[PDB]
Amino acid sequence: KVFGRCELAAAMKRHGLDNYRGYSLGNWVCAAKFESNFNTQATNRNTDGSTDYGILQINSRWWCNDGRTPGSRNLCNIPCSALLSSDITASVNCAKKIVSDGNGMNAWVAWRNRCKGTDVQAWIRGCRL
Ligand SMILES: [Cl-]
Ligand SMILES: [Cl-]
Ligand SMILES: [Cl-]
Ligand SMILES: [Cl-]
Ligand code: NA
C-alpha cells in the first residue's frame, strides 16, 4: 500500500507514534517519506546481506526474521514479511522498540541525514489530525 502523507500521519497517531520518545509526528512521516516513499511493500538489500522492510525500512540484522541474515537477531519477534502489510501496526510496534534502544531516531540514517534539524512539521501541515 502506498499511503498518502496525511493518511500515514493519521495512522501513525492512531498507533501512538505521535511524540513517542519525544519525537513529534512530523519526524516519523519525514522518516517514512525518505525510507520508503510511503510504500509499505518497500524492500532494500544491504551490502552485509541484511534487508530493510516496510514503510520505516526496518532491518533484519536486529529486528525481524527473514531466514536469510546469518547471525542476526529478531528483537521485535516478527517475520520481516509482517512489516510489508497494508496495516502498519507491526512496523509501528517495532519502531517503538528501535527508537527506545539508546540512539533515538538516529537509528534511521535517512532521518539523521534528511529530517533531523529540518522543519519536520511541514510533513503534517494541513492534515486533519
Ligand atoms: Cl511535527
Ligand atoms: Cl536469519
Ligand atoms: Cl494502518
Ligand atoms: Cl532521543
Ligand atoms: Na533477523
mmCIF file of C-alpha atoms and ligand atoms in Angstrom:
data_model
loop_
_atom_site.group_PDB
_atom_site.id
_atom_site.type_symbol
_atom_site.label_atom_id
_atom_site.label_comp_id
_atom_site.label_asym_id
_atom_site.label_seq_id
_atom_site.Cartn_x
_atom_site.Cartn_y
_atom_site.Cartn_z
ATOM 1 C CA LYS A 1 0.000 0.000 0.000
ATOM 2 C CA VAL A 2 1.275 3.484 -0.838
ATOM 3 C CA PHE A 3 -0.037 5.841 1.830
ATOM 4 C CA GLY A 4 -0.851 9.459 1.358
ATOM 5 C CA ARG A 5 1.038 11.892 3.553
ATOM 6 C CA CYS A 6 -1.886 12.831 5.796
ATOM 7 C CA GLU A 7 -3.266 9.293 5.689
ATOM 8 C CA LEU A 8 0.016 7.979 7.091
ATOM 9 C CA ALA A 9 0.217 10.711 9.733
ATOM 10 C CA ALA A 10 -3.242 9.725 10.986
ATOM 11 C CA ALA A 11 -2.383 6.018 11.042
ATOM 12 C CA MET A 12 0.837 6.699 12.966
ATOM 13 C CA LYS A 13 -1.057 8.833 15.509
ATOM 14 C CA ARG A 14 -3.724 6.088 15.790
ATOM 15 C CA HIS A 15 -0.942 3.686 16.748
ATOM 16 C CA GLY A 16 0.647 6.033 19.291
ATOM 17 C CA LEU A 17 3.780 7.258 17.485
ATOM 18 C CA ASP A 18 2.969 10.950 17.781
ATOM 19 C CA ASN A 19 5.551 12.252 20.289
ATOM 20 C CA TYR A 20 6.727 8.715 21.081
ATOM 21 C CA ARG A 21 10.069 9.036 22.924
ATOM 22 C CA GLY A 22 9.737 12.771 22.316
ATOM 23 C CA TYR A 23 9.648 12.551 18.511
ATOM 24 C CA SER A 24 6.815 14.589 17.030
ATOM 25 C CA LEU A 25 4.633 13.080 14.290
ATOM 26 C CA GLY A 26 6.384 15.045 11.554
ATOM 27 C CA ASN A 27 9.652 13.253 12.335
ATOM 28 C CA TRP A 28 8.008 9.888 11.723
ATOM 29 C CA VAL A 29 6.284 10.974 8.497
ATOM 30 C CA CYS A 30 9.521 12.509 7.208
ATOM 31 C CA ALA A 31 11.443 9.333 8.029
ATOM 32 C CA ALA A 32 8.845 7.210 6.231
ATOM 33 C CA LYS A 33 8.950 9.524 3.208
ATOM 34 C CA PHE A 34 12.674 9.088 2.715
ATOM 35 C CA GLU A 35 12.873 5.447 3.798
ATOM 36 C CA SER A 36 10.030 4.085 1.664
ATOM 37 C CA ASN A 37 8.235 6.932 -0.160
ATOM 38 C CA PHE A 38 5.237 5.846 1.967
ATOM 39 C CA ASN A 39 5.174 2.359 0.360
ATOM 40 C CA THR A 40 4.545 -0.470 2.829
ATOM 41 C CA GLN A 41 5.983 -3.002 0.348
ATOM 42 C CA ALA A 42 9.389 -1.312 0.092
ATOM 43 C CA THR A 43 12.418 -3.585 0.482
ATOM 44 C CA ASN A 44 16.107 -2.865 0.094
ATOM 45 C CA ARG A 45 19.060 -5.259 0.296
ATOM 46 C CA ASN A 46 22.162 -4.123 2.169
ATOM 47 C CA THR A 47 25.773 -4.994 1.416
ATOM 48 C CA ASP A 48 26.026 -7.105 4.591
ATOM 49 C CA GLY A 49 23.259 -9.416 3.343
ATOM 50 C CA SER A 50 20.568 -7.998 5.632
ATOM 51 C CA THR A 51 17.364 -6.500 4.218
ATOM 52 C CA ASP A 52 15.253 -3.466 5.188
ATOM 53 C CA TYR A 53 11.481 -3.895 5.166
ATOM 54 C CA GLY A 54 8.427 -1.713 5.006
ATOM 55 C CA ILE A 55 7.443 1.871 5.413
ATOM 56 C CA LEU A 56 10.226 2.522 8.006
ATOM 57 C CA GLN A 57 12.778 0.179 6.382
ATOM 58 C CA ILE A 58 13.356 -1.943 9.482
ATOM 59 C CA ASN A 59 16.469 -4.086 9.190
ATOM 60 C CA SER A 60 16.686 -7.881 9.546
ATOM 61 C CA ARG A 61 20.123 -7.765 11.233
ATOM 62 C CA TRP A 62 18.485 -6.973 14.583
ATOM 63 C CA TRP A 63 14.735 -6.568 14.412
ATOM 64 C CA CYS A 64 12.898 -9.201 12.374
ATOM 65 C CA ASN A 65 13.357 -12.696 10.994
ATOM 66 C CA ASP A 66 13.705 -13.321 7.267
ATOM 67 C CA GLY A 67 15.624 -16.610 7.452
ATOM 68 C CA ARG A 68 18.473 -15.308 5.300
ATOM 69 C CA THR A 69 20.516 -12.958 7.537
ATOM 70 C CA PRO A 70 23.182 -15.157 9.176
ATOM 71 C CA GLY A 71 23.957 -14.314 12.775
ATOM 72 C CA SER A 72 21.045 -11.913 13.041
ATOM 73 C CA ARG A 73 18.529 -11.367 15.811
ATOM 74 C CA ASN A 74 14.744 -10.956 15.775
ATOM 75 C CA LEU A 75 14.220 -8.486 18.614
ATOM 76 C CA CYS A 76 10.721 -7.479 17.501
ATOM 77 C CA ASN A 77 9.767 -11.203 17.391
ATOM 78 C CA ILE A 78 8.140 -10.976 13.951
ATOM 79 C CA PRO A 79 8.687 -12.263 10.443
ATOM 80 C CA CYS A 80 10.029 -9.446 8.294
ATOM 81 C CA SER A 81 7.071 -10.011 5.960
ATOM 82 C CA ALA A 82 4.774 -8.604 8.666
ATOM 83 C CA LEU A 83 6.468 -5.249 8.075
ATOM 84 C CA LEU A 84 5.128 -5.201 4.491
ATOM 85 C CA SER A 85 1.428 -5.291 5.408
ATOM 86 C CA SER A 86 -1.024 -2.551 4.472
ATOM 87 C CA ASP A 87 -1.717 -2.413 8.238
ATOM 88 C CA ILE A 88 1.215 -0.551 9.826
ATOM 89 C CA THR A 89 0.767 -1.986 13.345
ATOM 90 C CA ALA A 90 3.794 -4.294 13.178
ATOM 91 C CA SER A 91 6.059 -1.576 11.754
ATOM 92 C CA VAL A 92 4.919 0.905 14.425
ATOM 93 C CA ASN A 93 5.361 -1.544 17.298
ATOM 94 C CA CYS A 94 8.833 -2.435 16.076
ATOM 95 C CA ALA A 95 9.755 1.213 15.502
ATOM 96 C CA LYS A 96 8.855 1.930 19.141
ATOM 97 C CA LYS A 97 11.373 -0.631 20.256
ATOM 98 C CA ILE A 98 14.063 0.630 17.866
ATOM 99 C CA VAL A 99 13.684 4.290 18.875
ATOM 100 C CA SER A 100 13.933 3.267 22.544
ATOM 101 C CA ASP A 101 17.261 1.445 22.104
ATOM 102 C CA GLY A 102 19.509 4.385 23.017
ATOM 103 C CA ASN A 103 20.142 6.352 19.814
ATOM 104 C CA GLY A 104 16.641 7.651 19.249
ATOM 105 C CA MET A 105 15.741 8.270 15.659
ATOM 106 C CA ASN A 106 19.413 8.313 14.662
ATOM 107 C CA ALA A 107 18.852 4.573 14.183
ATOM 108 C CA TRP A 108 17.352 5.632 10.835
ATOM 109 C CA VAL A 109 20.294 7.021 8.885
ATOM 110 C CA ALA A 110 17.898 8.733 6.472
ATOM 111 C CA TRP A 111 16.184 10.509 9.363
ATOM 112 C CA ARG A 112 19.553 11.813 10.529
ATOM 113 C CA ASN A 113 20.586 12.865 7.037
ATOM 114 C CA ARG A 114 17.300 14.249 5.681
ATOM 115 C CA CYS A 115 14.919 15.092 8.550
ATOM 116 C CA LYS A 116 16.959 15.940 11.658
ATOM 117 C CA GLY A 117 17.235 19.698 12.030
ATOM 118 C CA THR A 118 14.652 20.499 9.349
ATOM 119 C CA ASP A 119 11.092 21.812 9.577
ATOM 120 C CA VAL A 120 9.577 18.365 10.068
ATOM 121 C CA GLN A 121 6.170 19.868 10.974
ATOM 122 C CA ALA A 122 5.772 20.628 7.266
ATOM 123 C CA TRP A 123 5.125 16.890 6.824
ATOM 124 C CA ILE A 124 1.880 17.060 8.844
ATOM 125 C CA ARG A 125 0.891 20.632 7.966
ATOM 126 C CA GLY A 126 -2.619 20.936 6.579
ATOM 127 C CA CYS A 127 -3.652 17.457 7.736
ATOM 128 C CA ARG A 128 -6.831 16.902 9.732
ATOM 129 C CA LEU A 129 -5.289 15.042 12.665
HETATM 130 CL CL CL B 1 5.771 17.639 13.801
HETATM 131 CL CL CL B 2 18.198 -15.278 9.603
HETATM 132 CL CL CL B 3 -2.806 1.117 9.382
HETATM 133 CL CL CL B 4 16.218 10.799 21.919
HETATM 134 NA NA NA B 5 16.927 -11.302 11.775
#
